[PDB]
Ligand binder design. Structure first.
Ligand SMILES: NC(=O)c1ccc[n+]([C@@H]2O[C@H](COP(=O)([O-])OP(=O)(O)OC[C@H]3O[C@@H](n4cnc5c(N)ncnc54)[C@H](OP(=O)(O)O)[C@@H]3O)[C@@H](O)[C@H]2O)c1
Ligand SMILES: Nc1nc(=O)c2nc(CNc3ccc(C(=O)N[C@@H](CCC(=O)O)C(=O)O)cc3)cnc2[nH]1
Ligand SMILES: [Mn+2]
Ligand SMILES: [Mn+2]
Ligand SMILES: [Mn+2]
Length: 159
């Protein structure tokens, strides 16, 4: 099974200038809980944005060019990325925009955080078709002293 996990600001913005400008510790904690002990697939730009391997996960990087770091696994196509995960119950795709586009048609589950923040951005989560997806979990949180925007965690499953 393939799942995508992402955090979206208003208008599906996910990034600006190869960064995420907000800081929501509760959402990073949600990301860690839902990805720990699973393989994670990311594009090269997202690898450079994170800047280091994510511990406790098999890190698989898509790039058309040879890898430059043997602490992670480098692959050159979507099918190779999936194969490199082996026989696991759930593969997590962690972006960015170009990678989400390619894996969305293959995904059964979306883990989405909707953040109430207006962000100028240059990268968006793909338009997906709402009729294809059932919301199976949603949890709203108001802003607090640690998290400066309100946010909603949602899990959707392909119908
Ligand atoms: N809010 C969130 O949830 C979230 C999550 C992830 C990322 N982001 C943000 O998203 C932005 C990065 O997204 P992006 O769309 O620019 O880049 P990306 O999807 O992270 O990376 C694209 C790169 O991945 C490689 N690639 C993708 N598909 C491939 C394929 N089929 N075969 C081979 N290589 C492939 C290519 O690398 P080469 O050029 O080396 O061939 C391509 O240039 C940043 O702003 C980041 O902060 C946000
Ligand atoms: N919901 C969601 N939020 C995100 O921030 C997110 N980020 C990415 C890609 N970028 C990043 C950037 C940083 C870390 C990171 O530092 N993660 C630590 C945090 C642990 C914690 O804060 O408790 C990790 O070990 O996962 C992960 C992904 C992909 N999907 C996402 N999905
Ligand atoms: Mn092929
Ligand atoms: Mn197999
Ligand atoms: Mn806000």
């Amino acid at each position: 099974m393939i799942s995508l996990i992402a955090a979206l600001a208003v208008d599906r913005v996910i990034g600006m200038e190869n960064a995420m400008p907000w800081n929501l510790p509760a959402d990073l904690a949600w990301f860690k809980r839902n990805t720990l002990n699973k393989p994670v697939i990311m594009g090269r730009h997202t690898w450079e944005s994170i800047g280091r391997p994510l511990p406790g996960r098999k890190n698989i990087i898509l790039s058309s060019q040879p890898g430059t770091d043997d602490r992670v696994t480098w692959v050159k196509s979507v099918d190779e990325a999936i194969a490199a995960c082996g026989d696991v119950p759930e593969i997590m795709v962690i972006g960015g925009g170009r990678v989400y586009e390619q894996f969305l048609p293959k995904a059964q589950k979306l883990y989405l955080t909707h953040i109430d923040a207006e962000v100028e951005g240059d990268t968006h989560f793909p338009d997906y078709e709402p009729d294809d997806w059932e919301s199976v979990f949603s949890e709203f949180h108001d802003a607090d002293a640690q998290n400066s925007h309100s946010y909603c965690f949602e899990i959707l499953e392909r119908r």
